[PDB]
Design a protein around this nucleic acid. Structure first.
Ligand SMILES: COC(=O)c1c(OC)cc2cc3c(c(O)c2c1C)C(=O)[C@]1(OC)C(=O)C=C(OC)[C@@H](O)[C@]1(O)C3=O
Ligand SMILES: [K+]
Ligand SMILES: [K+]
Ligand SMILES: [K+]
Ligand SMILES: [K+]
Ligand SMILES: [K+]
Ligand SMILES: [K+]
Ligand SMILES: [K+]
Ligand SMILES: [K+]
Ligand SMILES: [K+]
Ligand SMILES: [K+]
Ligand SMILES: [K+]
Ligand SMILES: [K+]
Ligand SMILES: [K+]
Ligand SMILES: [K+]
Ligand SMILES: [K+]
Ligand SMILES: [K+]
Ligand SMILES: [K+]
Ligand SMILES: [K+]
Ligand SMILES: [K+]
Ligand SMILES: [Mg+2]
Ligand SMILES: [Mg+2]
Ligand SMILES: [Mg+2]
Ligand SMILES: [Mg+2]
Ligand SMILES: [Mg+2]
Ligand SMILES: [Mg+2]
Ligand SMILES: [Mg+2]
Ligand SMILES: [Mg+2]
Ligand SMILES: [Mg+2]
Ligand SMILES: [Mg+2]
Ligand SMILES: [Mg+2]
Ligand SMILES: [Mg+2]
Ligand SMILES: [Mg+2]
Ligand SMILES: [Mg+2]
Ligand SMILES: [Mg+2]
Ligand SMILES: [Mg+2]
Ligand SMILES: [Mg+2]
Ligand SMILES: [Mg+2]
Ligand SMILES: [Mg+2]
Ligand SMILES: [Mg+2]
Ligand SMILES: [Mg+2]
Ligand SMILES: [Mg+2]
Ligand SMILES: [Mg+2]
Ligand SMILES: [Mg+2]
Ligand SMILES: [Mg+2]
Ligand SMILES: [Mg+2]
Ligand SMILES: [Mg+2]
Ligand SMILES: [Mg+2]
Ligand SMILES: [Mg+2]
Ligand SMILES: [Mg+2]
Ligand SMILES: [Mg+2]
Ligand SMILES: [Mg+2]
Ligand SMILES: [Mg+2]
Ligand SMILES: [Mg+2]
Ligand SMILES: [Mg+2]
Ligand SMILES: [Mg+2]
Ligand SMILES: [Mg+2]
Ligand SMILES: [Mg+2]
Ligand SMILES: [Mg+2]
Ligand SMILES: [Mg+2]
Ligand SMILES: [Mg+2]
Ligand SMILES: [Mg+2]
Ligand SMILES: [Mg+2]
Ligand SMILES: [Mg+2]
Ligand SMILES: [Mg+2]
Ligand SMILES: [Mg+2]
Lengths: 64, 5, 51, 84, 96
RNA sequence: UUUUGUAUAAUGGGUCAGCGACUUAUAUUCUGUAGCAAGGUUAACCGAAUAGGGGAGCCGAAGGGAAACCGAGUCUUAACU
RNA sequence: AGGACCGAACCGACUAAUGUUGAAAAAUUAGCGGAUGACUUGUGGCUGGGGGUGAAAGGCCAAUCAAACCGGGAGAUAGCU
RNA sequence: GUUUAUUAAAAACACAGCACUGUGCAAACACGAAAGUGGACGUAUACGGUGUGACGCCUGCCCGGUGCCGGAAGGUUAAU
RNA sequence: UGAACUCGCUGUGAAGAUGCAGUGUACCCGCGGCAAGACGGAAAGACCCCGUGAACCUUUACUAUAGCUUGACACUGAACA
RNA sequence: CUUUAAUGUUUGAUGUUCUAACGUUGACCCGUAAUCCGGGUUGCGGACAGUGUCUGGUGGGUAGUUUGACUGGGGCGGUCUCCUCCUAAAGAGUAACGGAGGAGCACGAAGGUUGGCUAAUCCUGGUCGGACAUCAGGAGGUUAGUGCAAUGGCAUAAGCCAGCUUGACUGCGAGCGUGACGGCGCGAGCAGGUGCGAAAGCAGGUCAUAGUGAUCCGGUGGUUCUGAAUGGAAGGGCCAUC
């Protein structure tokens, strides 16, 4: 049968031109008053999945 | 059955 | 501790607000400060409000 | 006889090591922004073309070669950058 | 995605965004495709008949990819700023 | 065989003959090799049937953005050195 | 008269020895307990598996019981050998 | 008397007797999706459950905790 | 029951040697006896630990539920205070 | 409005009668050769009891499960995250149920800036006044101070005092350090708009290092995004925050 996508990963990574994955940063959901604005500002932009992680992501997203 | 150690 | 969270609301018509922690017991009078409002792009008075 | 229970230690705690110390040595070429020393307090002081951060981290404000030197009446250790 | 019981990477990270339903009914056309239609008039019906776009498509943009040499008239499509210049240089015209 | 380590006094086998354990289906990715090449390929089905027909579809040649949208650029921002 | 006494048949199973690849998957020999009673025995019947029955030992329910046997789910699962 | 068929026969189980408690009869209670059946072709001097265990002398204090029984004012509280 | 041409001692050694080192003794093969050793045979230790194994049991562990119990609506009507 | 009275109406509750639903494991007749069942007559109950749907309580009677790891064997005891010092072998890192201590915050001033200032302790002389209060002088030279452990820092003070303030700003960020990663940290300089200062300049919290918790789910405010025929809306996204 077809491989099934891990649907929880499809909600969290998106593929990019050269095949890498962008993701949203952690730590920016709650408990925000105590975090410095410098720290919070750097967490807004999307980020690229690291080298050691790509193997795990690609397994979950066979049809990306 | 037997006595055990 | 008694240091409790509050928010400061822009006195302009914008919705923009800051959050901060206040010792409710020892300083019962409202905090009030001029701060930058990035919606109007001006320094404006901000006043304490409930979180 | 009876095997007798031991007690317990009251110690057993430590913190994570912080990787302080010199990160670029004398004569080493650096780019602007490069951290040269991680410190607690100013064990080294900022010389020419060197900045000091809020946690006393010394960093390059210009490209050049790191120069360590001793200066002043207190014989304090200063780090400076010399243009290449 | 199992990691020995550590919280796995696809669950440390927040979900984001949403899926547009309008995106699925939108297509992009290349300049090199404009020569493939029959009859020199480019519109959604003509591009569908050429099997250049799917039957469900309702919106299409011509974009500056490849090149076009024959004159063409583009009707009812949207056109990028760069694609417009290319069609005009070929002696075509865009209308709406 | 299992172990840091076995002549081990750790395991297993009395011997002979026969049988006895990395398979198959369908997706996906990488390598080799063959055809075609900005193109490649058909599925079901039809077929006096391994032919021929069938291009419905699928991958590729464009990306950025949560999205509207813009497009060799785009997002971020009032604006980018 | 008697859940009376002694003691055969009958019912049981307190001690010792033998046996332990036995004559026997619970026996034999010599002693032992009850023996008109809450006794024993023939034939037939009824109670069925989280159920039965139990003067209660988790005891018995076809040499099997802290949940019988047979068939099926079924090649359960086995980070173990 | 009874008991671990097949390593335990006993101080264990039962016992007559005692006490508490439930049950007014279409009884309580048990087996049954239910019908129905046992209790019982019985009727509180009867029937069920629990603890104790012939007989003799006896069985003292605690109702705070848990349980059961009675009460209903007030607080709270479901569907509607 | 791996195969044997199957001695003692002291040492060594997966740390308690018929089989290794050194050394002592010993013609080849039966029969009747005894059991000190072959860590002798029988049973994938029943003690202990482990397994994000099992079972059955307890309770003011958790979540349900049969039963018991409360009320509303239906079957279910008339009159009056 | 408040206290309050009657009338009318609606709706709820309680009580007493009634018969006709309903009950009858009361009697009698018939099916009938029948202590089952059904029909008939009659008596007693009677809108109760009983049953269905919904609902609160109780409920080891029954069922499915959970009940951590480390550990000089397990149990019992102790520990589980973060900061500082030693062990640690003069770069970084480095274990043990090794040796020693702390945190789970505080502060709109204890932050910014401009101006100024310099400690402990001891000895002399002085009302009450004493070993120790405030005052003057001297010695001393940081042996003090740092909001809270310890280490490293601090006189250009980072220690102490006063005036004016909100930079405890918004968008970004060359370039580095440290992690397997998630992440954490330092940062010149740009754009906007501020505070102190004559100006050069300084300010993106606090002498630095602890004062903390991913994702999911849900709440609150905003918004030039989306809106299942169409116009809205709900719901979702994005931004701030809980
Ligand atoms: C320390 O104690 C012993 O060393 C020992 C023992 O020393 C004389 C004798 C025995 C005897 C037996 C058992 C033993 O465990 C046992 C033990 C441990 C069993 O477990 C038994 O084994 C078939 C069984 O399966 C069930 C039974 O009772 C539930 C027993 O009756 C059993 O039948 C038996 O004979
Ligand atoms: K083996
Ligand atoms: K072993
Ligand atoms: K062994
Ligand atoms: K073994
Ligand atoms: K393959
Ligand atoms: K009989
Ligand atoms: K069973
Ligand atoms: K006896
Ligand atoms: K017994
Ligand atoms: K007694
Ligand atoms: K009591
Ligand atoms: K009581
Ligand atoms: K009481
Ligand atoms: K022997
Ligand atoms: K009647
Ligand atoms: K240990
Ligand atoms: K030990
Ligand atoms: K060290
Ligand atoms: K000040
Ligand atoms: Mg948010
Ligand atoms: Mg001993
Ligand atoms: Mg440390
Ligand atoms: Mg965990
Ligand atoms: Mg070993
Ligand atoms: Mg060897
Ligand atoms: Mg061996
Ligand atoms: Mg041997
Ligand atoms: Mg083996
Ligand atoms: Mg063997
Ligand atoms: Mg007799
Ligand atoms: Mg018997
Ligand atoms: Mg006999
Ligand atoms: Mg006799
Ligand atoms: Mg007798
Ligand atoms: Mg007799
Ligand atoms: Mg019989
Ligand atoms: Mg027992
Ligand atoms: Mg049997
Ligand atoms: Mg079972
Ligand atoms: Mg199955
Ligand atoms: Mg199997
Ligand atoms: Mg007797
Ligand atoms: Mg027995
Ligand atoms: Mg016996
Ligand atoms: Mg008793
Ligand atoms: Mg008493
Ligand atoms: Mg009560
Ligand atoms: Mg040898
Ligand atoms: Mg040798
Ligand atoms: Mg030798
Ligand atoms: Mg012999
Ligand atoms: Mg013998
Ligand atoms: Mg043996
Ligand atoms: Mg074993
Ligand atoms: Mg485990
Ligand atoms: Mg249970
Ligand atoms: Mg329970
Ligand atoms: Mg299960
Ligand atoms: Mg353990
Ligand atoms: Mg070191
Ligand atoms: Mg070293
Ligand atoms: Mg100053
Ligand atoms: Mg110090
Ligand atoms: Mg501090
Ligand atoms: Mg609509």
């Amino acid at each position: 049968p077809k491989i099934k996508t891990v649907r929880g990963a499809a909600k969290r990574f998106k593929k990019t031109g050269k095949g890498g994955f962008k993701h949203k940063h952690a730590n920016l959901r709650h408990i925000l008053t105590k975090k410095a604005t410098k720290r919070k500002r750097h967490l807004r932009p999307k980020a690229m999945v690291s080298k050691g992680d790509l193997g795990l992501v690609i397994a979950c997203l066979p049809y990306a | 059955a037997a006595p055990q150690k | 501790g008694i240091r409790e969270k509050i928010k400061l609301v822009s006195s302009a018509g914008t919705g923009h607000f800051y959050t901060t922690t206040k010792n409710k017991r020892t300083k019962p009078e409202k905090l009030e400060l001029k701060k930058f409002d990035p919606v109007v792009r001006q320094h404006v008075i901000y006043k304490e409000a409930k979180i | 006889a009876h095997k007798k229970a031991g007690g317990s230690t009251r110690n057993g705690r430590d913190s994570e090591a912080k990787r302080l110390g010199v990160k670029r040595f004398g004569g080493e070429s650096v780019l602007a922004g490069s951290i040269i020393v991680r410190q607690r307090g100013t064990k080294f002081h900022a010389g020419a073309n060197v900045g000091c951060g809020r946690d006393h981290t010394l960093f390059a404000k210009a490209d050049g070669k790191v120069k360590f030197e001793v200066k002043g009446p207190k014989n304090r250790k200063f780090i400076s950058i010399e243009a290449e | 995605g199992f990691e020995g019981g550590q919280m796995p990477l696809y669950r440390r990270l927040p979900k984001f965004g949403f899926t547009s339903r309008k995106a699925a009914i939108t297509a992009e056309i290349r300049l090199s495709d404009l020569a493939k239609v029959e009859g020199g008039v480019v519109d959604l019906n003509t591009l569908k008949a050429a099997n250049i776009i799917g039957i469900q498509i309702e919106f299409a943009k011509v974009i500056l990819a490849g090149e076009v040499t024959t004159p063409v008239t583009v009707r009812g499509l949207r056109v990028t700023k760069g694609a417009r210049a290319a069609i005009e240089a070929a002696g075509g015209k865009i209308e709406e």
